[PDB]
Amino acid sequence: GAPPIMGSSVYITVELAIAVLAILGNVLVCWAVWLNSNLQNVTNYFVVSLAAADIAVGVLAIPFAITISTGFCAACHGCLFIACFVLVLTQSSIFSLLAIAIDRYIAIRIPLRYNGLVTGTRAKGIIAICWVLSFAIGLTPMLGWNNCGQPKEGKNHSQGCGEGQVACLFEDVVPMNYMVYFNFFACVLVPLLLMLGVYLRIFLAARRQLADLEDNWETLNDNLKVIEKADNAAQVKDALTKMRAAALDAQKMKDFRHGFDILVGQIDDALKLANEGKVKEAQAAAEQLKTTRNAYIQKYLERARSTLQKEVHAAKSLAIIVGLFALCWLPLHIINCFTFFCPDCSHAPLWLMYLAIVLSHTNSVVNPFIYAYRIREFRQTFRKIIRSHV
Numbered sequence: 171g172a173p174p175i176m177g178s179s180v181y182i183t184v185e186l187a188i189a190v191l192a193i194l195g196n197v198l199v200c201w202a203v204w205l206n207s208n209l210q211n212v213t214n215y216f217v218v219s220l221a222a223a224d225i226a227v228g229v230l231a232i233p234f235a236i237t238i239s240t241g242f243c244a245a246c247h248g249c250l251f252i253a254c255f256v257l258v259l260t261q262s263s264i265f266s267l268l269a270i271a272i273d274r275y276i277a278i279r280i281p282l283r284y285n286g287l288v289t290g291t292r293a294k295g296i297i298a299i300c301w302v303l304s305f306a307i308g309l310t311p312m313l314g315w316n317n318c319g320q321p322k323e324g325k326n327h328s329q330g331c332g333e334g335q336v337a338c339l340f341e342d343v344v345p346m347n348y349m350v351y352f353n354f355f356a357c358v359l360v361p362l363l364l365m366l367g368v369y370l371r372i373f374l375a376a377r378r379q380l381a382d383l384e385d386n387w388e389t390l391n392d393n394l395k396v397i398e399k400a401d402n403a404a405q406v407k408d409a410l411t412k413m414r415a416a417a418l419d420a421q422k423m424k425d426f427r428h429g430f431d432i433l434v435g436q437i438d439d440a441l442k443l444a445n446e447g448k449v450k451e452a453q454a455a456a457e458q459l460k461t462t463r464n465a466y467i468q469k470y471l472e473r474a475r476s477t478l479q480k481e482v483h484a485a486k487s488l489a490i491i492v493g494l495f496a497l498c499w500l501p502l503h504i505i506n507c508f509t510f511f512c513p514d515c516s517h518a519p520l521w522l523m524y525l526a527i528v529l530s531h532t533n534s535v536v537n538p539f540i541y542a543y544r545i546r547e548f549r550q551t552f553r554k555i556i557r558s559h560v
């Protein structure tokens with residue numbers, strides 16, 4: 171067989187290339203949030219926590235991955251730390267992505283409550299807690315769910331390790347039942363499915379809010395035409411009562427309020443006329459509503475549509491991040507599933523293991539590109555930093 175060092179050199183070179191790009195791109199994310207007060211919101215606190223996890227992939231996880239690829243002699247608990255530390259960073263990533271999804275869900279479902287439910291101070295506490303939980307989940311093998319008690323004596327003696335030491339190889343020390351049931355099913359797949367469910371609920375909420383606006387609009391316009399071609403007070407009365415309901419629903423910022431005050435007032439004026447049986451004076455009064463609609467209501471309608479469209483576009487941007495996370499991490503998990511559940515199956519070849527590892531690391535490069543391409547405030551701030559400071 172080809173000398174192992176040849177394939178190792180290609181692996182190490184690619185890992186270091188990923189490390190540099192993971193560090194530089196994610197430092198730029200953090201720098202941008204620092205510089206630009208417009209990026210300093212709770213959602214971006216989770217973005218920075220995720221960027222920190224991706225920097226730590228370049229600074230620590232990749233060097234650990236290079237180290238463990240050599241099968242060097244190590245005390246089994248030191249070996250476990252090096253093997254498992256990336257699981258902490260990946261778990262931290264999952265918690266940040268989950269927090270972002272829920273943050274955007276609260277923002278679209280209860281916008282008025284959002285700013286007092288979701289504060290900076292609560293976000294900082296949630297981020298600290300998520301990082302502690304990530305250490306506990308990812309280093310669970312150090313608490314005794316490990317293969318340190320069943321060492322590979324053949325490998326130990328062939329590598330010439332001293333006593334207490336193992337040839338530090340991931341699949342020799344980390345149990346595959348931990349990797350498949352606990353890490354993959356419980357800690358990764360379940361949160362990814364929850365995130366899918368939350369984004370689905372975001373898109374369903376946006377669409378139902380957009381449909382309700384458009385229906386309120388149409389209720390207004392249709393009742394305006396019912397009133398015109400009407401033939402008695404009871405017709406005009408019914409249509410006006412519908413419009414009034416629709417108008418109070420649409421309402422649920424001074425120039426905004428003035429607009430709906432004019433509209434509802436005009437409706438109520440045309441409502442009192444109708445009740446007195448004055449059909450033509452009611453109908454005339456209702457013709458006033460058209461200029462109020464054109465001048466105030468159509469403006470609020472279009473601002474509300476535009477806001478919802480921006481929230482959908484932002485939610486799409488953030489969901490793409492979750493999909494690339496899944497794309498980058500699932501192959502390694504699926505390989506572990508084959509290793510674990512198919513003992514009759516040939517183990518995935520080494521080159522495929524290392525490709526899946528490298529792909530998982532590439533996840534720590536991509537998010538800065540998604541922010542630059544999809545989010546104007548990031549793109550513009552990256553431009554300022556690159557021009558001014560490079």
Ligand SMILES: CC(C)CCC[C@@H](C)CCC[C@@H](C)CCC[C@@H](C)CCCC(=O)OC[C@@H](O)[C@@H](O)CO
Pocket residue numbers: 186189190228229230232233234237242243244252
């Ligand atoms: C990647 C680059 C773009 C940026 C990196 C930045 C800097 C700070 C990286 C820091 C790297 C260190 C944290 C790496 C630690 C390396 C350790 C894990 C090596 C362990 C090897 C060891 O213990 O020696 C082997 C023998 O002692 C053993 O066989 C017998 O005990």
Ligand SMILES: CC(C)CCC[C@@H](C)CCC[C@@H](C)CCC[C@@H](C)CCCC(=O)OC[C@@H](O)[C@@H](O)CO
Pocket residue numbers: 174175177178180181184239240498520521522524525526528529532533536
């Ligand atoms: C994020 C996505 C949109 C794009 C990501 C791009 C992905 C596909 C990364 C591209 C890199 C690869 C084309 C090149 C990697 C080749 C590596 C994995 C070869 C490994 C060879 C190998 O087996 O080396 C290790 C062993 O030989 C042994 O020596 C132990 O070190």
Ligand SMILES: CC(C)CCC[C@@H](C)[C@H]1CC[C@H]2[C@@H]3CC=C4C[C@@H](O)CC[C@]4(C)[C@H]3CC[C@]12C
Pocket residue numbers: 243244245247248249251252
């Ligand atoms: C501030 C940052 C850079 C600190 C980084 C500290 C890291 C590199 C330290 C902390 C714990 C250390 C490990 C502790 C125990 C062992 C077992 C020994 O048999 C081989 C070395 C090994 C595997 C060490 C490698 C280096 C290590 C992982």
Ligand SMILES: CC(C)CCC[C@@H](C)[C@H]1CC[C@H]2[C@@H]3CC=C4C[C@@H](O)CC[C@]4(C)[C@H]3CC[C@]12C
Pocket residue numbers: 496497500501502504505508515516517518519522
């Ligand atoms: C998430 C997207 C990108 C899909 C990726 C699916 C990947 C992980 C799938 C596609 C085909 C799969 C391989 C098909 C056949 C075998 C041979 C078996 O003896 C070991 C596992 C192995 C080598 C599988 C491992 C996982 C595999 C490489």
Ligand SMILES: CC(C)CCC[C@@H](C)[C@H]1CC[C@H]2[C@@H]3CC=C4C[C@@H](O)CC[C@]4(C)[C@H]3CC[C@]12C
Pocket residue numbers: 500504507508511512
């Ligand atoms: C993508 C997300 C949503 C779903 C994850 C699907 C995973 C868990 C599925 C996809 C393909 C599946 C594998 C397909 C084939 C085999 C070979 C069989 O002898 C043991 C089970 C095993 C190894 C399956 C395990 C579970 C598996 C890896």
Ligand SMILES: Nc1nc(NCCc2ccc(O)cc2)nc2nc(-c3ccco3)nn12
Pocket residue numbers: 339340341349502503506520523524527
């Ligand atoms: N199975 C596995 N192996 C490794 N590295 C060892 C690759 C290998 C596998 C077998 C072998 O004989 C020599 C090397 N890193 C790994 N990282 C992960 C991982 C992280 C998150 C999910 O899976 N799984 N995983």
Ligand SMILES: CCCCCCCCCCCCCCCCCC
Pocket residue numbers: 174175178179182183186239240241
């Ligand atoms: C991109 C900067 C330079 C790239 C590094 C060159 C890679 C050569 C290092 C080889 C060291 C091999 C150590 C033992 C590996 C054997 C694993 C089975």
Ligand SMILES: CCCCCCCCCCCCCCCCCC
Pocket residue numbers: 297298301302305306309312313
């Ligand atoms: C907001 C700042 C980030 C806070 C990070 C602090 C994390 C400290 C380490 C966590 C301790 C948990 C220990 C559980 C694992 C023990 C296994 C030996």
Ligand SMILES: CCCCCCCCCCCCCCCCCC
Pocket residue numbers: 490493494496497536539540543
């Ligand atoms: C298994 C689900 C994975 C699906 C991937 C979703 C991503 C869609 C990509 C379209 C938008 C990408 C924007 C910029 C791409 C830059 C990539 C480096």
Ligand SMILES: CCCCCCCCCCCCCCC
Pocket residue numbers: 184187188191532535536539
């Ligand atoms: C071997 C290092 C892998 C780095 C791959 C990361 C891909 C990032 C996407 C960049 C696309 C840039 C397109 C510009 C037009």
Ligand SMILES: CCCCCCCCCCCCCCC
Pocket residue numbers: none
């Ligand atoms: C401020 C962080 C600097 C870290 C420098 C440490 C480099 C580690 C090199 C390990 C060499 C191991 C030799 C084994 C015989």
Ligand SMILES: CCCCCCCCCCCCCCC
Pocket residue numbers: 298299302303306307
């Ligand atoms: C920053 C204050 C410390 C956070 C306390 C975390 C609460 C942990 C409760 C249950 C731990 C379950 C860990 C799973 C192994």
Ligand SMILES: CCCCCCCCCCCCCCC
Pocket residue numbers: 302303306312313
């Ligand atoms: C054989 C070495 C195992 C060392 C474990 C000692 C530390 C206890 C773990 C407490 C974790 C609490 C974190 C909060 C969830």
Ligand SMILES: CCCCCCCCCCCCCCC
Pocket residue numbers: 511512
């Ligand atoms: C998202 C679906 C998750 C369910 C996957 C469970 C697969 C279990 C495979 C059992 C294989 C047992 C092999 C015995 C011969």
Ligand SMILES: CCCCCCCCCCCCCCC
Pocket residue numbers: 501516518519522525526529
């Ligand atoms: C990085 C995930 C996609 C990898 C696509 C490669 C598919 C080839 C799999 C064949 C491996 C068969 C070897 C078993 C003997």
Ligand SMILES: CCCCCCCCCCCCC
Pocket residue numbers: 200203204218222225226229
């Ligand atoms: C309000 C913006 C502050 C930016 C926080 C920067 C955190 C960087 C920590 C990275 C840790 C990697 C070793």
